[PDB]
Design a protein around this ligand. Structure first.
Ligand code: H1H
Ligand code: MG
Lengths: 239, 648, 599
């Protein structure tokens, strides 16, 4: 690994001011040559030479070098970057139940849990004349064992045979049985609804494919009702 | 003989209500005294005064509550740094220079989520209390500090209820990513500050989420030869990648704030993913041979930076992951002292309780600890003790030792050391301490002993404390006098008489809702000779349970272990009295807080588990000062950034 | 060690043994009463109630300890409710067969007795047999109060919560007849039977106080007897009924009843005195959070989870008998309701009026196997006699055996000298701490204490699962995370037959109550003199100066589916999974060898 040149061409720009100019010179641009894409650089000639002399040494090192070899050099070139940018790979929704309330020794309030599969935590802080009392936390773990969700596209053109892909998931270790049916509407022309029994493996998934052909233009309504061994759940979708 | 002890807190707080306890002894004719705080250095402007009646029905003990309001102090060009606690009666007239501070109250800032993404709203509210732990009703000026240290938004709000709801801070569509900071502040008269941190991170979504979950979160002596690292990748809930291509690289790091990393350009592995899971190993010793380091003595408190790029076989996508640091640790343990004062009493046993914490703060039980001790008496003659071993118990991580010291001890030099079975004695954690005996002219001591030390005190029940003197004038002692402190305020006092010829006796004390997080108890007596008298004192630190004054509890109805997305439930709050309840429903996957009593206890003055070098050090380390005939305080009011533990 | 083979004399009379210690200038002799070999057998049946004809299958354990004559075999016997002994088998503790019940055999509480060969004691295990069906739901009866005031003015409510076995709320109708039960037979109150609409498993029955007073106006007949409530609930479809009974509600004029019985009846003058009160409920269950006082000494405490509250009393030194009085000052009660009791403590008598005492003082509660409890050795006496004592000899008596004995050095000047004692799990359920010292080679001064360790297991056993819903006939996995080398037995019992007869089952609480009745101590503390400590602890003592304890008399001291596809559910057992697993898996670092089992 790191054949000969990859260790030397990166250590030269290990503590350079234009090490980032060398880093994006070695990126794969198949339809532009080395000088053809260097002309649009405007950061001075010092960054151009760090670009080009890291660009020519990778097109040579991609002819007779392995696929396994060059994708190890993609990780060796990682230290020519600025340090790891702050990013998160999750999206946490806007936190509900954010209010204060005056409680005369007992109070009840009701609300709808949001359409999300995550384990909430409700904590309460009571400020009164005696002091502060952080209550014992409670959880609101909305957790379905077998559930579907459909990949409804955002925008369907009128007159297309749309295949509505969806996937059932089965968190349980024992594989079980299910059937999904679709609420036909007057607009949707789909190719009383029969239940055909498919079967998910344990701790796995299973694809669900419907097909529609819409005719009317607007915001329609399609209800996907997965009826597994643990009841019947209607999932309401807007196409 | 006629003496008196007038006990005040160590530092007056401006705007507080400080309790000043006066106890006089050896009197028969009842009388009165005026405790008054005068200004400095003139004694002209009297801030507040009090009147106490020292009569026989009170057992010659009373207390006035004094108060320095902020509207009577010259601000602007300076703060006031000293006052005079002055006492005048027909039998005594003393005065002491007392420092004052403006650090009044607490500010807890509570944002809902710790990590935000762009175009989301930072919800924020401030729980404001004063130093008597009640709703402060003062105006608070929030400040929003970006990573660039800029005042990007300074919003202020008035308080009426104790919970100061602020408008929601809107993270922009393009923010400055990094650690932000919210700084709360009273607008006037007080130097109280609160600080809350949150993070702004850019949202990108992966084709599959790659995690790197290694074996242990620190490497010492057993993963220094083989370190099994596991890499997992999955698209969604259960959709897992089938094949992929894994390339790993490793590097040595100094600390997580210095972002320069010296990569080991020989340890770049290459494996294959098989339906999600690949187990790789990293022989650390042979791989750190470049940038030599040669040992586990070196690389100590250094990190390992593991970068992983998993390239999917089917679609061709390449998701990256990283670990910022796995600490290359020398010994897997850290030893400290839980609730041991480093002060002796001559002729009285010395209980030592060490705690074995691992290098990421867990209470590792079953870990054999060995104690060696050395008696250095008054004549500088080191005498060795027998070594004693014990086992760290798994419930709180605390081993227990007891040394029965000889009668003429002056300095104990004891060294703890782990005796784990499968580590070398250069990779065993060790610590060394030094305990100094309590000094007193006409050598006479006090040892107060809490009965149930192991379990926390329950409010409403009764504390039972056993008091032993070790005087040569034992039959001259008449009264045991005590003081109970909580949050730097004297909340109780009293006087139990001494049973005439019982060598030691027990005091019974009720534990109330004044002393909820913890408390101190300073007991003393007065042994008078033909010379000046002397107070002989000792103190302990108590561990009263966490029982709030009106017990809030919340419930969900119906209480199931699984809900439906869209299910209407009812939240059933139920307090003990009238209260303002603040609610927050946070998605618990952000945590990967609201601990308050470990911060609300920082109003306590003085540290350690009690004890002192002389009489006045016992009063000073409990968070008290005093003025007598018998002894003087003479205590240097320096900084002393002490670091004691007191709790498992 | 004494071999039991030599002991052949008939067990209506006792046997003694002299213990003769001969050596250089040493001849000592103590005569000691014998006993038989201790052995605790426990019987575990699968379910508590059977059906005539169905086989009863049982399981016998032991607390086996070390000997060599390991040919003592267990005799297992089944007995009719009229005491007719049917079977008697010399079973083997590895693999023994069940007992098939006859088809037309008697209905009632049977017995299983298990005893060793030539052992005179046994262990009983009960099970009913009757013609029943599984009751298909379950009733929890929670009363208002644990007690019932014999002269009050308030109504008694018994709330009814009926749930199905699979955890759904029963909707139906209940019949609640109250009544006052004397020791064996019931005397009902027929004007007090009601009918409640049970709505979503909720509804309570109120016993009006005048309706009770109209039946028993003579308050002298309500002396120390129970009040029941026979609840009979029926569902809305009329499909089935169950009958429950909230019994045990006592008719007393005080909510609490205190006994001393755990505190030493002997104090030392000058030292404090550790008084362990014991506040129980009227049946015998311990009472928690009950504040007691003792107004003659201004001390007051609060009972713990085991119903004890240690008070420390500051004694005057010039007293040789101590009248004390404890009264439970509970919070929201009126003054005339609270319990009270008095006692007198007889002072320790030193060897010749010398005034040399010893107060071993253990003050630590909720002691688990695994702590280090600190124990203080307090001395008191003439300052020349305290000058010449160097060590204490402490010893630990568990299950009537000297489990451990060490020494504790006292360097001079130390009146208080303490020790950490590590509670090993061999000390469950309790132990005694006898300690002494001697001065002048002439006089020994002793003291003991009784320490209550928490009655947990000596090892561990946790059955572990995912704790969620299953389907009928699905595959399940559970984990038997236990101590290694064990022989884990197993049974899976329906809840309809578990909660129907939850009285004869074995638990860890009932196991230690059979071993805590096997120690030879008579009180829970010191004695009148230095010999009265060693007698009252279950010890013997001999000296070279001829100071001997009293003789021990006895061993107890005073569009549808096609129906070719729906496989019908047909396997309905009441108990199954009668397995025996042997944990041979590798122990983890904490010591818990786990096995995953599937079924
Ligand atoms: C940031 O620098 C790189 C980017 C990339 C990138 O994916 O854009 C890269 N990838 C890459 O070679 N793939 C291989 C499989 C390949 C081989 C042959 C033909 C086409 C290929 O690509 C589709 C390598 C890179 O640096 C390696 C050392 C160069 C330096 C040391 C001069
Ligand atoms: Mg017990």
């Amino acid at each position: 690994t790191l054949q000969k040149k990859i260790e030397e061409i990166a250590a030269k720009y290990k503590h350079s001011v234009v090490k980032k100019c060398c880093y994006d010179g070695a990126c794969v641009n198949n339809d532009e040559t080395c000088e053809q894409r260097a002309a649009r650089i405007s950061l001075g000639p010092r960054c151009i030479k760090a670009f080009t002399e890291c660009c020519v040494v990778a097109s040579q090192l991609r002819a007779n070098i392995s696929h396994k070899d060059m994708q190890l050099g993609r990780l060796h070139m990682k230290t020519l970057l600025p340090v790891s940018k702050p990013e998160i790979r999750s999206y946490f929704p806007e936190s509900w139940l954010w209010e204060v309330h005056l409680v005369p020794r007992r109070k009840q309030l009701q609300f709808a849990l949001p359409d999300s599969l995550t384990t909430w935590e409700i904590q309460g802080v009571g400020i009164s004349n005696t002091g502060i009392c952080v209550a014992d936390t409670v959880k609101a773990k909305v957790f379905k064992d077998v559930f579907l969700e459909m990949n409804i596209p955002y925008s369907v053109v009128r007159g297309e045979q749309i295949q509505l892909k969806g996937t059932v998931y089965n968190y349980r270790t024992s594989g079980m049985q299910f059937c999904v049916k679709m609420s036909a509407v007057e607009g949707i022309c789909t190719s009383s609804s029969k239940c055909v029994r498919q079967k998910v493996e344990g701790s796995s998934s299973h694809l669900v494919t419907f097909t529609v052909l819409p005719l009317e233009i607007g915001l329609h309504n399609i209800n996907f009702s997965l009826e597994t061994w643990f009841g019947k759940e209607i999932l309401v979708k807007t196409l | 003989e006629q003496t008196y002890v007038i006990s005040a807190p160590k530092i007056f707080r401006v705007g507080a209500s400080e309790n000043i306890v006066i106890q006089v002894y050896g009197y028969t004719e009842a009388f009165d005294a005026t405790i008054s705080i005068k200004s400095y250095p003139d004694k002209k402007f009297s801030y507040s005064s009090g009147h106490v009646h020292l009569s026989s029905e009170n057992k010659f003990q009373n207390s006035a509550i004094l108060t320095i309001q902020p509207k009577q102090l010259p601000g602007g060009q300076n703060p006031v740094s000293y006052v005079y606690l002055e006492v005048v009666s027909k039998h005594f007239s003393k005065s002491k220079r007392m420092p004052i501070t403006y650090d009044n109250g607490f500010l807890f800032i509570h944002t809902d989520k710790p990590v935000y993404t762009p175009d989301q709203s930072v919800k924020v509210r401030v729980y404001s209390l004063n130093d008597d732990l009640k709703p402060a009703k003062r105006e608070t000026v929030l400040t929003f500090i970006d990573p660039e240290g800029s005042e990007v938004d300074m919003v202020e709000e008035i308080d009426h209820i104790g919970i100061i709801s602020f408008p929601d801070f809107k993270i922009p569509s393009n923010p400055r990513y990094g650690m932000w900071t919210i700084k709360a502040k009273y607008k006037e008269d007080f130097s109280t500050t609160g600080t809350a941190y949150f993070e702004v991170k850019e949202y990108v979504l992966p084709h599959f989420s790659v995690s790197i979950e290694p074996e242990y979160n620190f490497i010492g002596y057993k993963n220094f030869k083989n370190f099994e690292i596991t890499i997992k990748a999955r698209y969604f809930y259960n959709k897992v990648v089938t094949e992929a291509d894994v390339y790993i690289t490793f590097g040595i790091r100094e600390d997580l704030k210095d972002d320069q990393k010296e990569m080991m350009q020989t340890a770049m592995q290459n494996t294959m993913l098989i339906n999600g899971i690949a187990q790789v190993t990293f022989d650390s010793e042979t791989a750190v041979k470049e940038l030599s380091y040669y040992s586990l003595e070196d690389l100590n408190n250094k990190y390992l930076y593991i970068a992983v790029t998993v390239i999917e076989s089917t679609g061709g996508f390449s998701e990256e992951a990283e670990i910022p640091g796995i600490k290359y640790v020398l010994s897997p343990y850290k030893l400290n002292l839980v609730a041991t004062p480093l002060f002796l009493k001559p002729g009285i046993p010395y209980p030592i309780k060490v705690q074995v914490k691992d290098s990421l703060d867990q209470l590792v039980g079953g870990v054999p600890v060995t104690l060696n001790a050395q008696t250095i008496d008054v004549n500088q003659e080191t005498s060795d003790l027998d070594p004693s071993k014990s086992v760290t118990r798994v419930d709180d991580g605390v081993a227990s030792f007891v040394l029965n010291l000889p009668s003429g001890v002056t300095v104990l030099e004891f060294n703890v050391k782990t005796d784990a079975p499968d580590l070398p004695e250069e990779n065993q954690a060790r610590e060394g301490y030094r305990a100094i005996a309590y000094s007193s002219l006409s050598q006479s001591y006090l040892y107060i002993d809490w009965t149930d030390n192991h379990k926390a005190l329950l409010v409403g029940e009764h504390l039972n404390i056993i008091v032993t003197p070790k005087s040569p004038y034992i039959d001259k002692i008449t009264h045991y006098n005590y003081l109970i402190l909580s949050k730097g305020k004297i909340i109780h006092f009293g006087t139990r008489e001494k049973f005439s010829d019982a060598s030691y006796q027990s005091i019974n004390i009720p534990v109330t809702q004044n002393m909820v997080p913890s408390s101190r108890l300073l007991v003393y007596y007065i042994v008078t000779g033909e010379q000046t008298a002397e107070l002989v004192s000792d103190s302990v630190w108590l561990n009263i349970e966490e029982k709030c004054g009106n017990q809030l509890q919340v419930h969900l109805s119906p209480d199931a272990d699984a809900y439906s997305p869209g299910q209407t439930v009812s939240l059933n709050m139920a307090t003990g009295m009238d209260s303002w309840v603040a609610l927050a429903a946070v998605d618990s996957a952000v945590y990967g807080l609201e601990r308050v009593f470990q911060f609300l206890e920082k109003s306590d003055l003085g540290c350690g588990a009690g004890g002192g070098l002389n009489n006045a050090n016992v009063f000073h380390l409990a968070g008290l000062t005093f003025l007598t005939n018998a002894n003087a305080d003479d205590s240097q009011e320096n900084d002393e950034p002490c670091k004691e533990i007191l709790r498992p | 060690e004494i071999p039991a083979k030599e002991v052949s004399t008939d067990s209506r009379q006792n046997q003694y043994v002299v213990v003769q210690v001969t050596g250089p200038q040493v001849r000592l002799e103590k005569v000691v009463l014998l006993s038989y070999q201790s052995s605790f057998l426990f019987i575990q049946t699968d379910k508590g109630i059977y059906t005539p004809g169905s086989p009863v299958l049982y399981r016998v354990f032991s607390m086996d300890h070390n000997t060599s004559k390991m040919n003592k075999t267990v005799i297992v016997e089944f007995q009719t409710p009229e005491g007719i002994l049917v079977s008697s088998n010399s079973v083997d503790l590895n693999f023994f067969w069940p007992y098939n019940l006859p088809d037309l055999v008697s209905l009632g509480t049977w017995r299983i007795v298990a005893k060793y060969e030539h052992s005179p004691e046994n262990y009983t295990a009960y099970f009913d047999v009757r013609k029943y069906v599984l009751p298909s739901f379950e009733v929890r009866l929670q009363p208002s109060e644990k007690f019932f005031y014999i002269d009050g003015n308030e109504n008694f409510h018994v709330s009814i919560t009926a749930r199905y076995l699979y955890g759904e709320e029963v909707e139906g109708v209940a019949f609640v007849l109250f009544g006052v039960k004397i020791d064996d037979a019931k005397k009902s109150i027929p004007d007090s039977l009601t009918r409640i609409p049970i709505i979503d498993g909720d509804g309570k029955a109120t016993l009006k106080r005048d309706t009770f007073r109209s039946r028993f106006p003579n308050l002298n007949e309500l002396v120390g007897h129970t009040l029941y409530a026979s609840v009979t609930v029926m569902t809305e479809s009329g499909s089935d009924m169950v009958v429950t009974e909230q019994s045990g509600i006592h008719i007393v004029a005080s909510p609490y009843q205190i006994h001393f019985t755990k505190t030493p009846k002997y104090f030392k003058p000058g030292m404090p005195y550790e008084l362990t009160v014991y506040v129980t409920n009227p049946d015998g269950s311990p009472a928690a959070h009950v504040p007691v006082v003792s107004e003659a000494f201004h001390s007051m405490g609060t009972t713990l989870s085991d119903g004890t509250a240690k008070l420390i009393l500051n004694i005057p030194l010039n007293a040789q008998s101590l009248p004390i009085t404890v009264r439970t000052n509970h919070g929201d009660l009126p003054r005339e309701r609270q319990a009270t009791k008095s006692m007198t403590a007889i002072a320790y008598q030193t060897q010749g009026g010398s005034g040399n005492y010893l107060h071993v003082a253990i003050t630590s509660t909720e002691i688990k196997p695994g702590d280090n409890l600190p124990v203080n050795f307090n001395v008191k006496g003439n300052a020349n006699s305290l000058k010449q004592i160097k060590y204490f000899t402490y010893l630990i008596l568990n299950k009537g055996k000297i489990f451990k004995v060490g020494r504790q050095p006292r360097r001079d000047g130390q009146n208080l000298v303490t020790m950490n004692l590590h509670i090993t799990p061999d000390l469950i359920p309790s132990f005694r701490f006898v300690a002494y010292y001697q001065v002048g080679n002439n006089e020994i001064v002793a003291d003991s204490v009784w320490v209550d360790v928490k009655d947990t297991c000596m090892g561990t056993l946790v059955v572990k699962g995912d704790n969620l819903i299953q389907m009928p006939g699905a595959a399940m996995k559970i984990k038997l995370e236990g101590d290694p080398g064990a022989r884990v037995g197993l049974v899976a019992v329906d809840k309809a037959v578990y909660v129907l007869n939850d009285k004869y089952k074995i638990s860890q609480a009932k196991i230690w109550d059979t071993i805590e009745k096997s120690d030879f101590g008579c009180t829970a503390g010191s004695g009148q003199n230095n010999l009265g400590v060693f007698e009252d602890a279950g010890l013997a003592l001999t000296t070279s100066t001829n100071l001997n304890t009293k003789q021990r008399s006895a061993a107890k001291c005073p569009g549808f589916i096609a129906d070719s596809d729906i496989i019908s559910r047909s396997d309905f057992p009441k108990s199954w999974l009668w397995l025996t697993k042997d944990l041979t898996e590798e122990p983890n670092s904490q010591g818990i060898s786990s096995k995953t089992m599937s079924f």
